[PDB]
């Protein structure tokens, strides 16, 4: 029920997942991973750090990811509104030391 493998999970705090880009994730022409796989990893990691739903998100794809790469996604909760049951999660995803994806997710109870 999460895309890629959960490596680390501190509920209501932070989480880390790893997605190895295989044949199922790429355009045949260029062996480049489709951006919705990156999103899916990050969005499901954002849900994992919290039974919760995404309300919006602002996301940014930085490098093209190639097949054979391990994408490490790192979720951190950056604000909570106890009141309205609203949590914001920022997720940055890396291949080695380089960001390939960055997103802020607005979640709800």
Q: Please report, as ranges, the residues that interact with its own copies according to CB under 8 A.
A: 1, 3, 27-30, 32, 34-36, 39-40, 43-44, 51, 53-61, 64
- Min separation Cβ 60 and its own copies, Å: 4
Q: For residues 61 and 94, which CB has a smaller minimum distance to its own copies in the complex?
A: 61
Nearest distance, CB of residue 36 and its own copies, angstroms = 4
Q: What is the 3-state secondary structure (H, E, C) of the chain?
A: CCCCEEEEEECCCEEEEEEECCHHHECCCCCEECHHHHHHHHHHHHHHCCCCEEEEEEEEECCCCECCCEEEEEEEEEEEECCCCEEEEEEEEEECCEEEEEEEEEEEC
Instruction: Tell me how far, at minimum, the Cβ of 27 lies from its own copies, in Å.
Output: 6
């Amino acid at each position: 029920e999460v895309i890629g493998e959960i490596i680390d999970l501190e509920l209501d705090d932070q989480a880390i997942s790893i997605l190895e880009i295989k044949q199922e994730h790429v355009f045949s022409r260029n062996q480049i991973a489709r951006g919705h796989h990156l999103f899916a990893q990050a969005n499901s990691l954002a849900v994992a750090v919290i039974l919760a739903l995404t309300a919006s998100a602002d996301i940014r794809f930085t490098r093209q990811v190639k097949q054979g790469e391990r994408v490490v996604a790192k979720a951190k909760v950056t604000a909570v509104e106890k009141e309205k049951g609203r949590t914001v999660v920022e997720v940055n995803s890396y291949v080695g030391e380089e960001i390939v994806f960055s997103g802020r997710f607005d979640m709800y109870r």
